[PDB]
Design an enzyme around this catalytic site. Sequence first.
Site, PDB file in Angstrom:
ATOM      1  N   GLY A  29      46.299  42.444  33.484  1.00 52.37           N
ATOM      2  CA  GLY A  29      44.985  42.877  33.044  1.00 52.37           C
ATOM      3  C   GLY A  29      45.004  43.078  31.544  1.00 52.37           C
ATOM      4  N   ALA A  30      43.945  43.668  30.998  1.00 49.67           N
ATOM      5  CA  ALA A  30      43.874  43.903  29.560  1.00 49.67           C
ATOM      6  C   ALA A  30      44.933  44.916  29.129  1.00 49.67           C
ATOM      7  CB  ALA A  30      42.482  44.402  29.182  1.00 49.67           C
ATOM      8  N   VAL A  34      51.562  43.984  35.810  1.00 53.01           N
ATOM      9  CA  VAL A  34      52.071  44.749  36.943  1.00 53.01           C
ATOM     10  C   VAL A  34      53.172  43.884  37.533  1.00 53.01           C
ATOM     11  CG1 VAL A  34      51.572  45.818  39.161  1.00 53.01           C
ATOM     12  CG2 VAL A  34      49.806  45.742  37.385  1.00 53.01           C
ATOM     13  N   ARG A 165      39.460  43.626  48.802  1.00 56.03           N
ATOM     14  CA  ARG A 165      40.417  43.214  47.772  1.00 56.03           C
ATOM     15  C   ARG A 165      41.148  44.404  47.144  1.00 56.03           C
ATOM     16  NH1 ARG A 165      35.468  42.500  45.876  1.00 56.03           N
ATOM     17  NH2 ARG A 165      34.722  43.927  44.239  1.00 56.03           N
ATOM     18  N   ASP A 179      42.622  50.765  43.177  1.00 51.71           N
ATOM     19  CA  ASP A 179      41.578  50.412  42.223  1.00 51.71           C
ATOM     20  C   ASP A 179      42.342  49.709  41.123  1.00 51.71           C
ATOM     21  OD1 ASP A 179      38.948  52.094  40.275  1.00 51.71           O
ATOM     22  OD2 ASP A 179      39.626  50.016  40.401  1.00 51.71           O
TER      23      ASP A 179
HETATM   24  C1  RAJ Z   1      51.109  49.622  40.121  1.00 50.36           C
HETATM   25  C2  RAJ Z   1      49.770  50.218  40.437  1.00 50.36           C
HETATM   26  C3  RAJ Z   1      49.330  51.331  39.661  1.00 50.36           C
HETATM   27  C4  RAJ Z   1      48.043  51.885  40.001  1.00 50.36           C
HETATM   28  C5  RAJ Z   1      47.287  51.305  41.077  1.00 50.36           C
HETATM   29  C6  RAJ Z   1      46.001  51.892  41.442  1.00 50.36           C
HETATM   30  O1  RAJ Z   1      45.382  51.496  42.426  1.00 50.36           O
HETATM   31  N1  RAJ Z   1      45.577  52.890  40.621  1.00 50.36           N
HETATM   32  C7  RAJ Z   1      44.452  53.658  40.851  1.00 50.36           C
HETATM   33  C8  RAJ Z   1      43.723  54.183  39.738  1.00 50.36           C
HETATM   34  C9  RAJ Z   1      42.555  54.997  39.947  1.00 50.36           C
HETATM   35  C10 RAJ Z   1      41.747  55.550  38.782  1.00 50.36           C
HETATM   36  C11 RAJ Z   1      41.693  54.580  37.611  1.00 50.36           C
HETATM   37  C12 RAJ Z   1      40.857  53.358  37.942  1.00 50.36           C
HETATM   38  N2  RAJ Z   1      40.926  52.395  36.821  1.00 50.36           N
HETATM   39  C13 RAJ Z   1      39.752  51.516  36.903  1.00 50.36           C
HETATM   40  C14 RAJ Z   1      42.168  51.601  36.868  1.00 50.36           C
HETATM   41  C15 RAJ Z   1      42.118  55.287  41.292  1.00 50.36           C
HETATM   42  C16 RAJ Z   1      42.834  54.769  42.442  1.00 50.36           C
HETATM   43  C17 RAJ Z   1      42.376  55.059  43.906  1.00 50.36           C
HETATM   44  F1  RAJ Z   1      42.127  56.333  44.071  1.00 50.36           F
HETATM   45  F2  RAJ Z   1      41.293  54.367  44.183  1.00 50.36           F
HETATM   46  F3  RAJ Z   1      43.266  54.726  44.801  1.00 50.36           F
HETATM   47  C18 RAJ Z   1      43.996  53.957  42.175  1.00 50.36           C
HETATM   48  C19 RAJ Z   1      47.727  50.179  41.862  1.00 50.36           C
HETATM   49  C20 RAJ Z   1      49.011  49.644  41.504  1.00 50.36           C
HETATM   50  N3  RAJ Z   1      49.527  48.576  42.185  1.00 50.36           N
HETATM   51  C21 RAJ Z   1      49.214  47.266  41.937  1.00 50.36           C
HETATM   52  N4  RAJ Z   1      48.408  46.999  40.827  1.00 50.36           N
HETATM   53  C22 RAJ Z   1      47.964  45.764  40.401  1.00 50.36           C
HETATM   54  C23 RAJ Z   1      48.386  44.644  41.193  1.00 50.36           C
HETATM   55  C24 RAJ Z   1      49.220  44.874  42.345  1.00 50.36           C
HETATM   56  C25 RAJ Z   1      49.681  46.193  42.786  1.00 50.36           C
HETATM   57  C26 RAJ Z   1      50.543  46.400  44.017  1.00 50.36           C
HETATM   58  C27 RAJ Z   1      51.021  45.314  44.874  1.00 50.36           C
HETATM   59  C28 RAJ Z   1      51.812  45.722  45.988  1.00 50.36           C
HETATM   60  N5  RAJ Z   1      52.100  47.048  46.231  1.00 50.36           N
HETATM   61  C29 RAJ Z   1      51.669  48.082  45.450  1.00 50.36           C
HETATM   62  N6  RAJ Z   1      50.907  47.736  44.367  1.00 50.36           N
END
Ligand code: RAJ
Length: 290
Positions: A29-30, A34, A165, A179
């Site tokens: 992403g920007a 990951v 997604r 997210d």
């Molecule tokens: C490493 C990481 C870090 C943070 C998140 C993530 O969902 N963060 C997040 C962040 C927020 C608040 C910030 C939202 N921003 C728009 C990013 C809320 C949530 C909630 F509550 F909806 F779940 C979640 C996902 C992931 N994992 C990930 N990210 C991008 C591509 C693939 C993965 C992945 C693949 C397989 N297993 C685990 N993660």
Amino acid sequence: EHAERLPYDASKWEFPRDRLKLGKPLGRGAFGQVIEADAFGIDTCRTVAVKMLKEGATHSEHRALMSELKILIHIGHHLNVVNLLGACTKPGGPLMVITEFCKFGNLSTYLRSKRNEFVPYKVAPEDLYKDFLTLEHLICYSFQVAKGMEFLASRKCIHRDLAARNILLSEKNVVKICDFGPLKWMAPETIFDRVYTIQSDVWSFGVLLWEIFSLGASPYPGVKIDEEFCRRLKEGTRMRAPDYTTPEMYQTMLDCWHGEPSQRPTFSELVEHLGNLLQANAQQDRHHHH
Ligand SMILES: Cc1ccc(C(=O)Nc2cc(CCCN(C)C)cc(C(F)(F)F)c2)cc1Nc1ncccc1-c1ccncn1
């Protein structure tokens, strides 16, 4: 929110960068990238997902990732919200946010791959349906996301982009709300007046349900998302029942898509309802219970 300013319990969350074995990229992403990695002693060895801040990132981008980290910490733990496991924030390397790894990927893509491996329910001999998906799995995923959203709501959060997604599938059929940072998932009040509330998340949940019971299909097939789409949506037009739905699940989608946000069910009511549907389905077959 200025979440980046929140106190950081380093003894609890800080993980040594040298305890990570970096692997294949999972996305970008920007903010940066990951990547998949194996962490040793973050709890042994455990596979994790690492969101890393790009080199030369802008102050706003750096602030954004730190904010996301603090928000995840603030939200707290829940089985159905992607689990934060640690972070790398001290000097000597990039800012990194570490979460659990969900081996099956996003639900939309996963469900799509199981269209030839699905049956309403198994019948003995059940090995003829090894690893097949069933209505029980689909209701179970639905139930878990509702539980996760009920949790986020209890912590005063509004997701704003709930969709298949953004749901990951891990072992033991456990799903996680994420997210990664969407007209077809937006409630009418959101589309026309940019209003976001937990109740607009419920509308999106209804679309997610359609995605689940269509086994990963794209919402509103055969329809161009333009002013005509919005006009008809506001008028009451809704998607038809998906191919793998039950009557109860389809009515639930319709309920989630009520024109008046106050008339849509709450996530707590969805948890109750879906839980009952799941229990009924899980205990329905008495074959092995003589
Ligand atoms: C490493 C990481 C870090 C943070 C998140 C993530 O969902 N963060 C997040 C962040 C927020 C608040 C910030 C939202 N921003 C728009 C990013 C809320 C949530 C909630 F509550 F909806 F779940 C979640 C996902 C992931 N994992 C990930 N990210 C991008 C591509 C693939 C993965 C992945 C693949 C397989 N297993 C685990 N993660």
